[PDB]
Protein backbone atom coordinates (compact mmCIF):
# COMPACT_ATOMS: atom_id res chain seq x y z
CA UNK A 1 0.00 0.00 0.00
CA UNK A 2 1.37 3.42 -0.98
CA UNK A 3 -1.26 5.26 1.15
CA UNK A 4 -0.53 6.53 4.68
CA UNK A 5 -2.91 8.06 7.23
CA UNK A 6 -2.11 10.16 10.30
CA UNK A 7 -4.75 10.46 13.02
CA UNK A 8 -4.44 13.08 15.77
CA UNK A 9 -6.26 11.94 18.94
CA UNK A 10 -5.80 9.94 22.15
CA UNK A 11 -3.94 6.87 20.83
CA UNK A 12 -1.02 6.06 18.54
CA UNK A 13 2.65 5.09 18.32
CA UNK A 14 3.70 8.73 18.77
CA UNK A 15 3.41 11.37 21.49
CA UNK A 16 2.80 14.97 20.53
CA UNK A 17 5.55 17.16 22.00
CA UNK A 18 4.19 20.39 20.52
CA UNK A 19 2.44 21.81 17.48
CA UNK A 20 3.59 25.03 15.85
CA UNK A 21 1.01 26.66 13.57
CA UNK A 22 3.55 28.32 11.29
CA UNK A 23 1.33 29.56 8.44
CA UNK A 24 -2.40 29.40 7.70
CA UNK A 25 -5.04 27.67 9.89
CA UNK A 26 -3.44 25.36 12.42
CA UNK A 27 -4.15 21.85 13.67
CA UNK A 28 -5.73 21.14 17.08
CA UNK A 29 -3.30 19.97 19.76
CA UNK A 30 -3.84 16.26 20.60
CA UNK A 31 -1.96 13.79 22.82
CA UNK A 32 -0.83 11.34 20.17
CA UNK A 33 -0.67 10.72 16.45
CA UNK A 34 -1.65 7.29 15.14
CA UNK A 35 0.02 6.38 11.80
CA UNK A 36 -1.53 3.76 9.49
CA UNK A 37 -0.47 2.27 6.16
CA UNK A 38 -3.87 2.45 4.41
CA UNK A 39 -6.88 4.71 3.79
CA UNK A 40 -9.12 5.37 6.80
CA UNK A 41 -12.68 6.45 6.00
CA UNK A 42 -14.03 5.94 9.54
CA UNK A 43 -12.83 8.92 11.63
CA UNK A 44 -11.67 7.25 14.94
CA UNK A 45 -13.33 8.17 18.24
CA UNK A 46 -11.79 10.97 20.30
CA UNK A 47 -9.74 11.99 17.25
CA UNK A 48 -9.41 15.62 16.17
CA UNK A 49 -8.02 15.33 12.61
CA UNK A 50 -6.96 12.94 9.84
CA UNK A 51 -4.20 13.66 7.33
CA UNK A 52 -3.46 11.31 4.46
CA UNK A 53 -1.26 10.97 1.41
CA UNK A 54 0.50 8.55 -0.90
CA UNK A 55 4.07 7.65 -1.75
CA UNK A 56 4.72 8.46 -5.42
CA UNK A 57 7.41 8.79 -8.10
CA UNK A 58 10.16 11.42 -8.34
CA UNK A 59 8.99 14.78 -9.74
CA UNK A 60 12.15 16.97 -9.82
CA UNK A 61 15.31 15.15 -8.78
CA UNK A 62 17.77 14.18 -11.56
CA UNK A 63 19.91 11.01 -11.62
CA UNK A 64 23.04 12.55 -10.03
CA UNK A 65 20.99 14.07 -7.22
CA UNK A 66 19.35 10.67 -6.69
CA UNK A 67 22.78 9.01 -6.57
CA UNK A 68 24.06 11.60 -4.11
CA UNK A 69 21.00 11.03 -1.90
CA UNK A 70 21.26 7.24 -1.95
CA UNK A 71 24.91 7.41 -0.88
CA UNK A 72 24.14 9.10 2.49
CA UNK A 73 20.42 9.04 3.34
CA UNK A 74 19.39 6.94 6.38
CA UNK A 75 16.52 4.47 6.62
CA UNK A 76 13.42 5.15 8.69
CA UNK A 77 13.01 3.35 12.02
CA UNK A 78 16.62 3.61 13.21
CA UNK A 79 16.61 2.71 16.93
CA UNK A 80 18.12 6.15 17.75
CA UNK A 81 15.51 8.20 15.81
CA UNK A 82 13.14 8.80 18.71
CA UNK A 83 12.11 12.30 17.63
CA UNK A 84 9.96 12.94 14.57
CA UNK A 85 8.29 15.94 12.92
CA UNK A 86 5.27 15.84 10.62
CA UNK A 87 4.99 18.93 8.42
CA UNK A 88 1.96 19.46 6.16
CA UNK A 89 2.43 21.98 3.35
CA UNK A 90 0.14 23.59 0.81
CA UNK A 91 1.49 25.55 -2.15
CA UNK A 92 -0.33 28.29 -4.04
CA UNK A 93 -2.39 28.03 -7.25
CA UNK A 94 0.23 30.16 -8.94
CA UNK A 95 2.79 27.39 -8.24
CA UNK A 96 0.60 24.60 -9.63
CA UNK A 97 -0.19 26.43 -12.87
CA UNK A 98 3.54 26.87 -13.58
CA UNK A 99 5.17 24.61 -16.14
CA UNK A 100 7.64 21.89 -15.19
CA UNK A 101 10.88 23.77 -16.09
CA UNK A 102 9.63 26.81 -14.11
CA UNK A 103 8.97 24.73 -11.01
CA UNK A 104 12.24 22.80 -11.39
CA UNK A 105 14.13 26.09 -11.74
CA UNK A 106 12.63 27.47 -8.50
CA UNK A 107 13.08 24.17 -6.63
CA UNK A 108 16.82 23.56 -7.26
CA UNK A 109 18.41 26.26 -9.42
CA UNK A 110 17.09 29.06 -7.16
CA UNK A 111 16.26 27.37 -3.85
CA UNK A 112 18.91 24.61 -3.77
CA UNK A 113 16.38 22.35 -2.00
CA UNK A 114 18.35 19.15 -2.58
CA UNK A 115 21.81 20.65 -2.02
CA UNK A 116 20.66 22.24 1.26
CA UNK A 117 18.87 19.12 2.49
CA UNK A 118 21.95 16.99 1.80
CA UNK A 119 23.87 18.94 4.46
CA UNK A 120 21.46 17.52 7.11
CA UNK A 121 22.06 13.86 6.13
CA UNK A 122 22.65 11.29 7.58
CA UNK A 123 21.32 12.72 10.85
CA UNK A 124 17.85 13.29 9.30
CA UNK A 125 15.58 10.58 7.81
CA UNK A 126 12.61 11.68 5.72
CA UNK A 127 9.53 10.54 3.81
CA UNK A 128 7.48 12.52 1.30
CA UNK A 129 3.78 11.95 0.73
CA UNK A 130 1.58 13.72 -1.83
CA UNK A 131 -2.08 14.66 -1.21
CA UNK A 132 -3.20 17.48 -3.51
CA UNK A 133 -4.45 14.92 -5.97
CA UNK A 134 -6.71 13.40 -3.26
CA UNK A 135 -8.67 16.59 -2.53
CA UNK A 136 -6.99 17.15 0.87
CA UNK A 137 -6.55 20.57 2.48
CA UNK A 138 -2.79 20.22 2.20
CA UNK A 139 -0.69 19.36 -0.83
CA UNK A 140 2.05 17.38 0.99
CA UNK A 141 2.84 15.49 4.17
CA UNK A 142 6.54 15.66 5.03
CA UNK A 143 7.98 13.36 7.71
CA UNK A 144 11.33 13.63 9.48
CA UNK A 145 12.91 11.56 12.23
CA UNK A 146 16.24 11.84 13.97
CA UNK A 147 17.97 11.36 17.31
CA UNK A 148 17.80 14.31 19.79
CA UNK A 149 21.39 15.40 19.14
CA UNK A 150 20.11 16.63 15.75
CA UNK A 151 17.15 18.77 16.91
CA UNK A 152 19.18 21.98 16.70
CA UNK A 153 20.36 21.30 13.16
CA UNK A 154 16.85 20.33 12.11
CA UNK A 155 15.52 23.68 13.40
CA UNK A 156 18.26 25.36 11.43
CA UNK A 157 17.19 23.50 8.28
CA UNK A 158 13.55 24.70 8.71
CA UNK A 159 14.58 28.37 8.86
CA UNK A 160 16.71 27.97 5.71
CA UNK A 161 13.98 26.32 3.65
CA UNK A 162 11.57 29.06 4.75
CA UNK A 163 14.01 31.70 3.48
CA UNK A 164 14.13 30.19 -0.02
CA UNK A 165 12.38 31.40 -3.17
CA UNK A 166 10.38 28.14 -3.05
CA UNK A 167 8.79 29.08 0.27
CA UNK A 168 7.24 32.20 -1.27
CA UNK A 169 4.67 29.87 -2.87
CA UNK A 170 3.89 28.11 0.41
CA UNK A 171 0.52 29.23 1.78
CA UNK A 172 0.01 26.72 4.63
CA UNK A 173 2.44 25.02 7.03
CA UNK A 174 2.14 23.26 10.40
CA UNK A 175 4.90 21.62 12.47
CA UNK A 176 3.78 18.57 14.49
CA UNK A 177 6.68 17.54 16.79
CA UNK A 178 6.59 13.94 18.00
CA UNK A 179 8.33 11.46 20.33
CA UNK A 180 8.24 7.70 19.63
CA UNK A 181 6.37 5.72 22.33
CA UNK B 1 -13.70 17.50 -8.75
CA UNK B 2 -10.48 16.24 -10.31
CA UNK B 3 -11.65 12.57 -10.21
CA UNK B 4 -13.23 10.92 -13.28
CA UNK B 5 -14.78 7.43 -13.49
CA UNK B 6 -15.46 5.27 -16.57
CA UNK B 7 -17.81 2.27 -16.21
CA UNK B 8 -18.28 -0.28 -18.98
CA UNK B 9 -21.68 -1.96 -19.08
CA UNK B 10 -25.15 -1.41 -20.47
CA UNK B 11 -25.70 2.32 -19.85
CA UNK B 12 -23.82 5.58 -20.48
CA UNK B 13 -23.41 8.59 -22.78
CA UNK B 14 -21.05 6.65 -25.07
CA UNK B 15 -21.53 3.62 -27.34
CA UNK B 16 -18.67 1.17 -27.67
CA UNK B 17 -17.74 0.82 -31.36
CA UNK B 18 -14.93 -1.67 -30.70
CA UNK B 19 -12.31 -2.66 -28.14
CA UNK B 20 -8.77 -3.48 -29.26
CA UNK B 21 -6.64 -5.29 -26.70
CA UNK B 22 -3.31 -3.95 -28.00
CA UNK B 23 -0.94 -5.11 -25.25
CA UNK B 24 -1.38 -7.25 -22.13
CA UNK B 25 -4.70 -8.40 -20.55
CA UNK B 26 -7.59 -6.63 -22.28
CA UNK B 27 -10.96 -5.24 -21.19
CA UNK B 28 -14.27 -7.15 -21.56
CA UNK B 29 -16.35 -5.90 -24.48
CA UNK B 30 -19.48 -3.99 -23.34
CA UNK B 31 -22.21 -1.94 -25.01
CA UNK B 32 -21.59 1.45 -23.43
CA UNK B 33 -19.35 3.51 -21.19
CA UNK B 34 -20.81 5.75 -18.48
CA UNK B 35 -18.53 8.71 -17.58
CA UNK B 36 -18.91 10.34 -14.16
CA UNK B 37 -17.11 13.28 -12.56
CA UNK B 38 -16.58 11.73 -9.13
CA UNK B 39 -15.43 8.53 -7.43
CA UNK B 40 -17.67 5.47 -7.66
CA UNK B 41 -17.26 2.91 -4.87
CA UNK B 42 -20.63 1.28 -5.63
CA UNK B 43 -19.82 -1.11 -8.52
CA UNK B 44 -22.87 -0.36 -10.80
CA UNK B 45 -25.31 -3.10 -11.79
CA UNK B 46 -24.60 -5.05 -15.01
CA UNK B 47 -21.17 -3.41 -15.32
CA UNK B 48 -18.08 -5.30 -16.43
CA UNK B 49 -15.34 -2.89 -15.33
CA UNK B 50 -14.59 0.48 -13.77
CA UNK B 51 -11.59 2.70 -14.55
CA UNK B 52 -10.87 5.90 -12.65
CA UNK B 53 -8.31 8.67 -12.53
CA UNK B 54 -7.63 12.24 -11.48
CA UNK B 55 -6.58 15.34 -13.41
CA UNK B 56 -3.26 16.66 -12.10
CA UNK B 57 -0.48 19.20 -12.60
CA UNK B 58 1.94 19.16 -15.52
CA UNK B 59 4.79 16.62 -15.12
CA UNK B 60 7.01 17.09 -18.26
CA UNK B 61 5.93 20.00 -20.52
CA UNK B 62 7.98 23.20 -20.38
CA UNK B 63 6.58 26.73 -20.72
CA UNK B 64 7.28 27.05 -24.48
CA UNK B 65 5.57 23.70 -25.09
CA UNK B 66 2.60 24.76 -22.93
CA UNK B 67 2.32 27.90 -25.01
CA UNK B 68 2.26 26.01 -28.30
CA UNK B 69 -0.37 23.63 -26.94
CA UNK B 70 -2.57 26.50 -25.77
CA UNK B 71 -2.39 28.24 -29.15
CA UNK B 72 -4.15 25.36 -30.93
CA UNK B 73 -5.65 22.74 -28.64
CA UNK B 74 -9.45 22.44 -28.96
CA UNK B 75 -11.94 22.36 -26.10
CA UNK B 76 -13.80 19.19 -25.22
CA UNK B 77 -17.38 18.56 -26.27
CA UNK B 78 -17.33 20.32 -29.62
CA UNK B 79 -20.52 19.56 -31.56
CA UNK B 80 -18.67 17.71 -34.30
CA UNK B 81 -16.45 15.59 -31.97
CA UNK B 82 -18.78 12.55 -32.12
CA UNK B 83 -15.99 9.94 -32.00
CA UNK B 84 -13.87 9.23 -28.92
CA UNK B 85 -11.13 6.84 -27.87
CA UNK B 86 -10.29 5.92 -24.28
CA UNK B 87 -6.79 4.44 -24.00
CA UNK B 88 -5.56 3.07 -20.64
CA UNK B 89 -1.79 2.69 -20.41
CA UNK B 90 0.55 1.07 -17.91
CA UNK B 91 4.31 1.73 -17.96
CA UNK B 92 7.02 -0.57 -16.51
CA UNK B 93 8.61 -0.56 -13.03
CA UNK B 94 11.82 0.28 -14.86
CA UNK B 95 10.18 3.47 -16.18
CA UNK B 96 8.91 4.47 -12.74
CA UNK B 97 12.26 3.99 -10.97
CA UNK B 98 14.02 6.33 -13.39
CA UNK B 99 14.79 9.88 -12.35
CA UNK B 100 13.07 13.01 -13.63
CA UNK B 101 15.76 14.03 -16.20
CA UNK B 102 15.82 10.44 -17.59
CA UNK B 103 12.04 10.26 -18.13
CA UNK B 104 11.93 13.79 -19.52
CA UNK B 105 14.60 12.85 -22.07
CA UNK B 106 12.90 9.67 -23.27
CA UNK B 107 9.54 11.48 -23.41
CA UNK B 108 10.59 14.53 -25.50
CA UNK B 109 14.27 14.41 -26.52
CA UNK B 110 14.10 10.87 -27.98
CA UNK B 111 10.34 10.40 -28.56
CA UNK B 112 9.14 13.93 -29.46
CA UNK B 113 5.79 13.14 -27.75
CA UNK B 114 4.61 16.77 -27.74
CA UNK B 115 6.03 17.81 -31.12
CA UNK B 116 4.48 14.70 -32.71
CA UNK B 117 1.11 15.16 -30.96
CA UNK B 118 0.96 18.85 -31.97
CA UNK B 119 0.79 17.80 -35.63
CA UNK B 120 -2.69 16.30 -34.89
CA UNK B 121 -4.16 19.48 -33.35
CA UNK B 122 -6.73 21.00 -33.59
CA UNK B 123 -8.50 17.97 -35.11
CA UNK B 124 -7.95 15.98 -31.87
CA UNK B 125 -9.06 17.01 -28.38
CA UNK B 126 -7.55 15.18 -25.38
CA UNK B 127 -7.76 14.74 -21.62
CA UNK B 128 -5.14 13.09 -19.42
CA UNK B 129 -5.79 11.35 -16.13
CA UNK B 130 -3.39 9.72 -13.69
CA UNK B 131 -4.15 6.60 -11.60
CA UNK B 132 -0.98 4.73 -10.61
CA UNK B 133 -1.16 6.71 -7.39
CA UNK B 134 -4.64 5.34 -6.64
CA UNK B 135 -3.44 1.72 -7.01
CA UNK B 136 -5.36 1.02 -10.24
CA UNK B 137 -4.29 -1.71 -12.66
CA UNK B 138 -3.45 1.03 -15.14
CA UNK B 139 -1.17 4.02 -14.66
CA UNK B 140 -3.05 6.40 -17.01
CA UNK B 141 -6.35 6.97 -18.76
CA UNK B 142 -6.06 8.98 -21.95
CA UNK B 143 -9.05 10.44 -23.72
CA UNK B 144 -9.28 11.68 -27.31
CA UNK B 145 -12.24 13.00 -29.25
CA UNK B 146 -12.62 14.18 -32.81
CA UNK B 147 -14.82 14.40 -35.87
CA UNK B 148 -14.81 11.39 -38.29
CA UNK B 149 -12.87 13.32 -40.92
CA UNK B 150 -9.97 12.96 -38.42
CA UNK B 151 -10.19 9.19 -37.74
CA UNK B 152 -7.55 8.15 -40.27
CA UNK B 153 -5.15 10.78 -38.88
CA UNK B 154 -5.77 9.65 -35.29
CA UNK B 155 -4.89 6.10 -36.41
CA UNK B 156 -1.64 7.42 -37.94
CA UNK B 157 -0.84 9.17 -34.65
CA UNK B 158 -1.31 5.92 -32.63
CA UNK B 159 1.15 4.05 -34.85
CA UNK B 160 3.74 6.81 -34.60
CA UNK B 161 3.61 6.94 -30.79
CA UNK B 162 3.91 3.14 -30.55
CA UNK B 163 7.11 3.19 -32.62
CA UNK B 164 8.65 5.65 -30.17
CA UNK B 165 11.33 4.94 -27.55
CA UNK B 166 8.76 5.95 -24.90
CA UNK B 167 6.52 3.04 -25.94
CA UNK B 168 9.17 0.43 -25.10
CA UNK B 169 8.24 1.09 -21.47
CA UNK B 170 4.52 0.49 -22.06
CA UNK B 171 3.53 -2.92 -20.73
CA UNK B 172 -0.29 -2.73 -21.03
CA UNK B 173 -2.57 -0.94 -23.48
CA UNK B 174 -6.22 -1.07 -24.59
CA UNK B 175 -8.09 1.17 -27.04
CA UNK B 176 -11.82 1.65 -26.37
CA UNK B 177 -13.43 3.31 -29.41
CA UNK B 178 -16.66 5.25 -28.83
CA UNK B 179 -19.46 7.17 -30.52
CA UNK B 180 -21.42 9.92 -28.75
CA UNK B 181 -25.11 9.19 -28.08
C1 LIG C 1 16.20 16.92 5.31
C2 LIG C 1 16.72 16.95 4.09
C3 LIG C 1 15.86 17.12 2.91
C4 LIG C 1 16.14 16.56 1.71
C5 LIG C 1 17.42 15.80 1.38
C6 LIG C 1 15.05 16.84 0.87
C7 LIG C 1 15.04 16.38 -0.43
C8 LIG C 1 13.96 16.50 -1.23
C9 LIG C 1 13.94 16.09 -2.59
C10 LIG C 1 15.09 15.46 -3.39
C11 LIG C 1 12.70 16.37 -3.06
C12 LIG C 1 12.23 16.13 -4.48
C13 LIG C 1 11.51 14.80 -4.60
C14 LIG C 1 11.04 14.59 -6.01
O1 LIG C 1 11.79 14.78 -7.00
O2 LIG C 1 9.86 14.22 -6.21
C15 LIG C 1 11.99 16.95 -1.98
C16 LIG C 1 10.69 17.38 -2.11
C17 LIG C 1 10.08 18.12 -1.13
N1 LIG C 1 10.62 18.50 0.06
FE1 LIG C 1 12.34 18.12 0.77
N2 LIG C 1 14.14 17.53 1.53
C18 LIG C 1 14.53 17.76 2.78
C19 LIG C 1 13.89 18.45 3.80
C20 LIG C 1 12.67 19.08 3.68
C21 LIG C 1 12.02 19.90 4.63
C22 LIG C 1 12.54 20.27 6.00
C23 LIG C 1 10.82 20.27 4.06
C24 LIG C 1 9.70 21.11 4.57
C25 LIG C 1 9.58 21.62 5.77
C26 LIG C 1 10.77 19.69 2.75
C27 LIG C 1 9.72 19.83 1.88
C28 LIG C 1 9.67 19.23 0.64
C29 LIG C 1 8.48 19.30 -0.24
C30 LIG C 1 7.19 20.01 0.06
C31 LIG C 1 8.73 18.60 -1.35
C32 LIG C 1 7.79 18.43 -2.53
C33 LIG C 1 8.04 19.54 -3.56
C34 LIG C 1 7.01 19.74 -4.66
O3 LIG C 1 6.53 18.80 -5.34
O4 LIG C 1 6.67 20.90 -4.95
N3 LIG C 1 11.93 19.00 2.57
N4 LIG C 1 12.78 17.02 -0.85
C1 LIG D 1 -3.01 14.18 -29.74
C2 LIG D 1 -1.95 14.95 -29.46
C3 LIG D 1 -1.21 14.68 -28.24
C4 LIG D 1 -0.65 15.68 -27.54
C5 LIG D 1 -0.64 17.12 -27.99
C6 LIG D 1 -0.15 15.11 -26.37
C7 LIG D 1 0.49 15.86 -25.43
C8 LIG D 1 0.91 15.38 -24.23
C9 LIG D 1 1.65 16.14 -23.30
C10 LIG D 1 2.08 17.58 -23.48
C11 LIG D 1 1.91 15.35 -22.24
C12 LIG D 1 2.70 15.75 -21.01
C13 LIG D 1 1.79 16.13 -19.85
C14 LIG D 1 2.58 16.60 -18.64
O1 LIG D 1 3.68 17.24 -18.69
O2 LIG D 1 2.11 16.33 -17.52
C15 LIG D 1 1.33 14.09 -22.54
C16 LIG D 1 1.38 13.02 -21.68
C17 LIG D 1 0.93 11.78 -22.08
N1 LIG D 1 0.43 11.42 -23.29
FE1 LIG D 1 0.09 12.54 -24.81
N2 LIG D 1 -0.43 13.81 -26.35
C18 LIG D 1 -1.06 13.46 -27.44
C19 LIG D 1 -1.49 12.20 -27.81
C20 LIG D 1 -1.30 11.05 -27.06
C21 LIG D 1 -1.73 9.74 -27.38
C22 LIG D 1 -2.46 9.29 -28.61
C23 LIG D 1 -1.40 8.94 -26.32
C24 LIG D 1 -1.61 7.50 -26.14
C25 LIG D 1 -2.10 6.68 -27.06
C26 LIG D 1 -0.74 9.75 -25.38
C27 LIG D 1 -0.29 9.28 -24.18
C28 LIG D 1 0.24 10.10 -23.20
C29 LIG D 1 0.59 9.61 -21.86
C30 LIG D 1 0.49 8.18 -21.34
C31 LIG D 1 1.05 10.66 -21.17
C32 LIG D 1 1.54 10.63 -19.77
C33 LIG D 1 3.03 10.30 -19.75
C34 LIG D 1 3.58 10.27 -18.34
O3 LIG D 1 3.18 11.10 -17.45
O4 LIG D 1 4.45 9.40 -18.08
N3 LIG D 1 -0.69 11.02 -25.88
N4 LIG D 1 0.70 14.13 -23.78
CL1 LIG E 1 11.12 10.60 -0.11
CL1 LIG F 1 -4.33 17.32 -20.56
Author numbering:
A (entry chain B), B (entry chain A): 2 to 182
Quote the passages of the study that discuss this structure, keeping the authors' original sentences.
OmpK36 GD, referred to as simply ‘OmpK36’, is a 373 amino acid outer membrane porin from Klebsiella pneumonia involved in nutrient and antibiotic diffusion in gram negative bacteria, while Cld is a heme-b-containing homodimeric oxidoreductase from Cyanothece sp. PCC7425, consisting of 181 amino acids per monomer. The effectiveness of AnACor is demonstrated for long-wavelength data sets collected at 3.54 Å, on a crystal of the membrane protein OmpK36 GD, and at 4.13 Å, on a crystal of the heme-binding enzyme chlorite dismutase (Cld). The choice of these two samples for this study was motivated by their crystallization in low-symmetry space groups, posing a challenge for the conventional absorption correction methods used in standard X-ray diffraction scaling programs.
In addition to three methionines and one cysteine per polypeptide chain, each Cld monomer also binds an Fe-containing heme ligand and a Cl− anion. A single SO4 2− anion could be identified for the dimer, bringing the total number of anomalous scatterers to 13. For Cld, the merging R factors, I/σ(I) and anomalous slopes are noticeably better for AC compared with SH. In contrast to OmpK36, where data quality indicators changed little between the SH and AC strategies, for Cld, the analytical absorption correction strategy (AC) gives substantially better data statistics compared with SH. For instance, in terms of the merging R factors, we observe a decrease of the R merge from 0.163 with SH to 0.112 with AC and a further decrease to 0.095 with the ACSH treatment. The anomalous slope value increases from 1.36 with SH to 2.48 and 2.5 for AC and ACSH, respectively. This indicates an impressive improvement in the anomalous signal as a result of applying analytical absorption corrections. For the largest peaks, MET99 and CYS132, we observe increases in peak heights from 14 to 17 and 18σ for AC and ACSH, respectively. However, while the difference between AC and ACSH is small, they outperform the spherical harmonics correction. This is in particular reflected in the outcome from experimental phasing, where two data sets are sufficient for both AC and ACSH, while three data sets are needed to solve the structure from data corrected by SH.
